[PDB]
Each structure stands twice: as structure tokens, then as C-alpha cells.
Amino acid sequence: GSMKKWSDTEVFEMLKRMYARVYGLVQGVGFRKFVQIHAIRLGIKGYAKNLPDGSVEVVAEGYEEALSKLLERIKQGPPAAEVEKVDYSFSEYKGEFEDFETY
């Protein structure tokens, strides 16, 4: 058996801005709302700026464990619309948004 041991990965401080550019007919339907439920559940900040032009940008902001959860959610469970080409971009946070709301 083992003798040495170590632990790693626990929620502490800071979080990364996940830019998520969602394309397609995701306008109208509760796409940005669905992203809200999980984001809120997992303690994510940002804003879901559904400019009514097919191409809605989201500036969600997550840690690691909470990141992977909110990420794995979206792709796994697509919106109730014809998502055309959801091309997200892992970025970094300039600053934290005051909670997370939808346009």
C-alpha cells in the first residue's frame, strides 16, 4: 500500500471569465435562462447579453470545480433552440460582474 499522501483542488479565491459566444436561433427561448439556473446554482457571476440578432454573447465567470460543472452542463444539455455554432472562448477576468443577469 501507500505511505505518502497529498490533497489538492478546493474552492478558495478568484475565478476566470469564460466568454461564451452562442450562435443560432437561441433568441426568444429560455437559453440564457437555462444558463442562469445552473450559473446561479453554482455561484457564477457575469451577464447574458442576448442582443436579438442570433449571436448572443455571455460573459459567465467561474472557478474550477464550479467552472467544469457550468461548462459540462451547457454542451451536454443544449438549449431548446437551433444552436448553430456555440464557439466559446476561455479567457481571463478583467473584473467581476455584479452577480449574473440576462438581457
| 43 falls within a domain | yes
- Whether 48 and 56 have beta carbons less than 8 Å apart is answered as yes
Query: Which residue among the candidates 17, 21, 41, 50 is catalytic per the annotation?
Result: 50
Return the closest-CA partner of residue 97 out of 46, 57, 61.
46
Q: How far are the Cα atoms of 25, 51, 84, 97 from residue 68, in angstroms, in the given order? A: 25, 26, 22, 19
Query: Which residue among the candidates 17, 32, 41, 73 is catalytic per the annotation?
Result: 32
Q: How many domains does the chain contain in total?
A: 1
Q: Is 89 exposed, middle or buried (0-12, 13-18, 19+ CB in 10 A)?
A: exposed
| 88 falls within a domain | yes
As a dihedral over the C-alpha atoms of residue 8, residue 64, residue 99, residue 59, rounded to 10 degrees, the angle is 160
The answer to whether 32 is a known catalytic residue is yes
Enclosing domain of residue 68: 15-103
- Whether 21 and 75 have beta carbons less than 8 Å apart is answered as no
Return the closest-CA partner of residue 50 out of 38, 36, 62, 39.
36
- Whether 45 and 15 have beta carbons less than 8 Å apart is answered as yes
Q: What is the amino acid identity at position 50?
A: N
Angle 47-35-11 from CA coordinates, rounded to 5°? 80
Output the domain CATH number for residue 80. 3.30.70.100
